[PDB]
Amino acid sequence: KVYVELQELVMDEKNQELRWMEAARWVQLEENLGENGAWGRPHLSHLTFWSLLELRRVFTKGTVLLDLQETSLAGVANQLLDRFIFEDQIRPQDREELLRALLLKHSHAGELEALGGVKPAVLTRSGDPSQPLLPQHSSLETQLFCEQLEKIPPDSEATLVLVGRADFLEQPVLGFVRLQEAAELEAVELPVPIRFLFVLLGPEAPHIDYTQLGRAAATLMSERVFRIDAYMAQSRGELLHSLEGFLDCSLVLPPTDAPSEQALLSLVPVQRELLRRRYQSSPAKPDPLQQTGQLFGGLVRDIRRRYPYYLSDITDAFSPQVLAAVIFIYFAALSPAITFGGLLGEKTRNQMGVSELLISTAVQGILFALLGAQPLLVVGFSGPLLVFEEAFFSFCETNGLEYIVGRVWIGFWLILLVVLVVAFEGSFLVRFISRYTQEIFSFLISLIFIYETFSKLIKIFQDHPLQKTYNYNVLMVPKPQGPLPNTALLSLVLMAGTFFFAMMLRKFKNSSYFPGKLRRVIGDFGVPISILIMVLVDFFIQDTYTQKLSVPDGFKVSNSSARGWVIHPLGLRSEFPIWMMFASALPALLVFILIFLESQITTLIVSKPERKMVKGSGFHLDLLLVVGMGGVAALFGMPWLSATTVRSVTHANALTVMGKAQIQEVKEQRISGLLVAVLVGLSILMEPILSRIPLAVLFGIFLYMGVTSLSGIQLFDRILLLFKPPKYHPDVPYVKRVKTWRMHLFTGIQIICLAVLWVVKSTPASLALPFVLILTVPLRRVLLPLIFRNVELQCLDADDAKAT
Amino acid sequence: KWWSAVVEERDAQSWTISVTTPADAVIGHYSLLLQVSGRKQLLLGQFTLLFNPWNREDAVFLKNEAQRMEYLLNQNGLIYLGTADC
Ligand SMILES: CCCCCCCC(=O)OC[C@H](COP(=O)(O)O[C@@H]1[C@H](O)[C@H](O)[C@@H](OP(=O)(O)O)[C@H](OP(=O)(O)O)[C@H]1O)OC(=O)CCCCCCC
Ligand SMILES: CCCCCCCCCCCC(=O)OC[C@H](COP(=O)(O)OCC[N+](C)(C)C)OC(=O)CCCCCCCCCCC
Ligand SMILES: CC(C)CCC[C@@H](C)[C@H]1CC[C@H]2[C@@H]3CC=C4C[C@@H](O)CC[C@]4(C)[C@H]3CC[C@]12C
Ligand SMILES: *[C@@H]1O[C@H](CO)[C@@H](O)[C@H](O)[C@H]1NC(C)=O
């Protein structure tokens, strides 16, 4: 490699004195000098077409001084101008002013800031520089690489390219000089001797930018083939022949209105062939659901996919939307925690209660946020887990078995099961769960959530019926022992009000009122604003009773006389039998299928391609974390949790940034879920705050989440299309490429599946819901092609919403 | 004699339709649209409507074919200048 320096004749700003200033330099890669005074990022040299066209024109009639016995810029310029005149390239009257320009002071980057900067100058017959007349074009290299020396080998020789504009010239002129011996000149401050000198002088002319001309000449000198030819050329024609080969192997890229990487990489064979042609004459030679067949391969790839994004997973949470999402998901995960913990304490005789669920949710959420590959999932108790708890309690009480110790052994089996599943990459079976099962499960879960919220409101009405007369002296501890006036109606009013305010602020976010950023902010905090408004409304009505949030008194076991914080696997009061230590696998099996299906389907729904998640989702790490944490928590008398669908979907939706109707990005970070888990753990100490929050406001919030979670489900959209006329139907591939009655038959089969699952959930055999849900995969993969074409299935059951 | 359309030839995939316009129709640029029941309007295309010297019922009807070509189709005209005697 050699050093090439390009200097341009410019005039300064303080004394208006013309001089030479370095504009770029080359050590193979090209560096450019910005107006600030610093060198830009080094880059591969790209040339304009006009610079190479003009460089070939001046080089054809150029002036060559090969093996010239001079060791000074004054000596070179005297000989160069003497043969310029002999070649009739400049007139003898021009020699005096051109020699004055060449032997001027050559400034460098160390004096750009010391001076007032430089502006382009054109030499005149008079000494004072003329202001350029042609329209100025700012250098593309400066705009693209500059607005923000040890590589030189000891034996290397340098090349100086000088470009300048003089109005008193007929045509641009090229002077090429190869010194007999490489000498040090005052123009170059670097301690590298100069062998070659490019001099490019001429008038202002169209299609000629002398900075680009110098860049082309310096790039040509920086090329290895031409430089070897330049060292061995004893005539102008040999340099001309090398230039022609340089242009023969050049690749011109025409303008296009649709640039792309793939179209550009289609020229890789062309670039390789052109480089091969150039060096053929010179003596130089040219210098997440896949199965890998490896143990724990999915887990390692899951870690490597997401863990590099850990720094972004903290910094991306510095937005008010994340805080609003924290306030949302805190209530959305705390109220189900309290309700399920109360039901657990009522059923299990307080062996497992509210405090255990709260602490388990907090610890598991903190660990999942810190270590999970998809931190947008919310980990907490769910309905099927409660049903399993009641079933196992009934079984343990039937055969005189301790319930919590059986839970310990079930978790011990769960750890082994999840280790075996992860070690064999068993999470790749998730790829057989297409949009069919995912959307059926999501729609069923949202419908169940809405139905349960309405059932809670109905139960409030039954507990406090509307009647002509009421008992006024009723006992108020620990809950209403009788009907109360204005209670059910106020609960209805609060629920409707908070739902209405949440929906109004959601429409305000997408509305065109107020400053948009303020509207976006206000809209982000829409659910907290509605919650605060209705909490204040109930606060200012003091006479009426409304049921409030109740948290445990402290961080103590829910039943002090039954168990401690740690459970002995051999038994608490009686010896645990040997046969149940082995028989706990089957209930552990059922729990594993429940948790696996719920968590992996939730991960599939949340991490859909249409949701615009670029940080990746791990199906092996999250399952291992959730099931192992549940198995460990079983040893501490704590519930095993799962990645719930509604809470995770709401959490992802609250972090989604909408474009200007179209998903733009999601704030994928680890801080929001961590703060929700920490607040759930701290909720015991926040009793004076939570005790003034009514359950009706949270019921309206639940209704909002239920109606919101249906936005991205194509099954819900097609069910709407059932009530919607075909002409109205949207421009989507399953409408435009599938017949309307075929689409409705597809929707009706999905509806029949939903009805079957709802019926199954209504029976005591509701723990078989995972298996019946699994049965929808053989449906789509076998029976659906027996009545639907492949085109229809591709359009309707599309992974990324594609038109086949 | 008014706006009308009839299918003349038809295969399983296409209809050959003969479309009439009234002899006293408004001239100018027209849009042709097709309405199918249960469907929104569809623009078939655009056409320009002109006076018709070839049609008996038109107000610009010319009796003679030679007169029709001379006075409407011939783009190569002659303007007579000079004087009456030259
Ligand atoms: C709450 C403010 C109190 C009013 C104080 C009175 C002062 C006051 O707020 O008005 C002047 C000011 C004008 O400033 P300006 O027009 O530059 O501000 C535009 C406004 O922020 C829009 O919401 C933005 O659109 P989007 O939504 O981001 O897409 C738009 O950006 P863009 O996208 O077009 O490039 C912004 O340019 O605001 C209004 O726009 C009028 C609405 C008045 C707001 C009145 C609301 C009651
Ligand atoms: C968007 C927000 C929600 C909107 C929907 C409104 C639903 C309100 C709940 C009604 C059903 C219900 O709960 O009624 C059921 C209750 C309870 O009957 P019971 O015999 O005591 O129960 C028997 C069970 N025991 C034996 C345990 C007690 O009936 C009533 O007390 C009758 C009064 C109903 C008042 C309806 C309010 C106005 C609703 C219309 C508003 C547009
Ligand atoms: C996957 C997990 C649950 C391990 C499977 C459980 C079986 C294989 C093992 C694990 C721990 C074992 C127990 C460990 C220690 C003893 C004490 C000894 O005096 C009697 C047998 C007994 C009680 C063992 C019985 C078998 C046992 C219960
Ligand atoms: C706690 O357990 C004891 C004995 O096991 C039982 O008698 C009591 O009812 C339990 N407490 C509650 C609140 O259920």
From Swiss-Prot, chain A:
Q: What are the start and end residues of every segment in region (Interaction with ANK1)?
A: 121-130
Mutating L624P leads to what result?
In SPH4; Most
The answer to whether UniProt assigns keyword Coiled coil to this entry is no
- The chain's disulfide connectivity reads none
The UniProt-reported impact of K1E is: In Di(a)/Memphis-II antigen
Q: What Gene Ontology biological process does one annotation of this record name?
A: monoatomic anion transport
Looking at the UniProt record, the site noted as Important for anion-proton cotransport sits at: E598
The protein's recorded glycosylation sites are N559
Could you say which tissues express the protein in this record? Detected in erythrocytes (at protein level).
Q: What is the effect of changing V405M?
A: In SPH4; Coimbra; also in AR-dRTA
Q: Which residues cross the membrane?
A: 321-344, 353-373, 377-393, 403-423, 436-458, 488-508, 520-540, 581-601, 618-636, 637-654, 671-691, 692-710
Q: What is the effect of changing E575K?
A: In WR(a) antigen
Q: What is the effect of changing R435C?
A: In SPH4; Dresden
Enumerate the InterPro entries for this protein: Anion_exchange, Anion_exchange_1, Anion_exchange_CS, Band3_cytoplasmic_dom, HCO3_transpt-like_TM_dom, HCO3_transpt_euk, PTrfase/Anion_transptr
PTM description: N-glycosylated.
Query: Impact of mutating T469I?
Result: In WARR antigen
> What disorder does this protein's entry note?
Ovalocytosis, Southeast Asian: An autosomal dominant hematologic disorder characterized by ovalocytic erythrocytes that are rigid and exhibit reduced expression of many erythrocyte antigens. Clinical manifestations include mild hemolysis, intermittent jaundice and gallstones. However, the disorder is most often asymptomatic. Spherocytosis 4: An autosomal dominant form of spherocytosis, a group of hematologic disorders characterized by the presence of numerous abnormally shaped erythrocytes which are generally spheroidal. Affected individuals have anemia, jaundice, and splenomegaly. Clinical severity is variable. Some individuals are asymptomatic, whereas others have severe hemolytic anemia requiring erythrocyte transfusion.
UniProt record similarity statement: Belongs to the anion exchanger (TC 2.A.31) family.
Name it: Band 3 anion transport protein
* Source organism per UniProt: Homo sapiens (Human)
User: Which lineage?
Assistant: Eukaryota, Metazoa, Chordata, Craniata, Vertebrata
Name the gene that codes for it. Answer: SLC4A1
From Swiss-Prot, chain B:
Give the result of A25T, as annotated: In SPH5; Nippon/Fukuoka
Where is the protein localized?
Cell membrane; Cytoplasm, Cytoskeleton
Superkingdom per UniProt? Eukaryota
* PTM info: Both cAMP-dependent kinase (CAPK) and another kinase present in the red-blood cells seem to be able to phosphorylate EPB42.
Assembly mode: Component of the ankyrin-1 complex in the erythrocyte, composed of ANK1, RHCE, RHAG, SLC4A1, EPB42, GYPA, GYPB and AQP1. Interacts with SLC4A1 (via the cytoplasmic domain); this interaction is mediated by the SLC4A1 Band 3-I dimer. Interacts with ANK1 (via ANK 1-13 repeats). Interacts with AQP1 (via the C-terminal).
Q: What does this protein do?
A: Component of the ankyrin-1 complex, a multiprotein complex involved in the stability and shape of the erythrocyte membrane.
Q: Which disease is it linked to?
A: Spherocytosis 5: Spherocytosis is a hematologic disorder leading to chronic hemolytic anemia and characterized by numerous abnormally shaped erythrocytes which are generally spheroidal. Absence of band 4.2 associated with spur or target erythrocytes has also been reported.
Query: What more is known?
Result: The substitution of an Ala for a Cys in the active site may be responsible for the lack of transglutaminase activity of band 4.2.
Q: Which family does the record assign?
A: Belongs to the transglutaminase superfamily. Transglutaminase family.
Q: What is this protein called?
A: Protein 4.2
Q: Which organism is it from?
A: Homo sapiens
The residues of the intact protein that this chain contains are 88 to 173 of 691
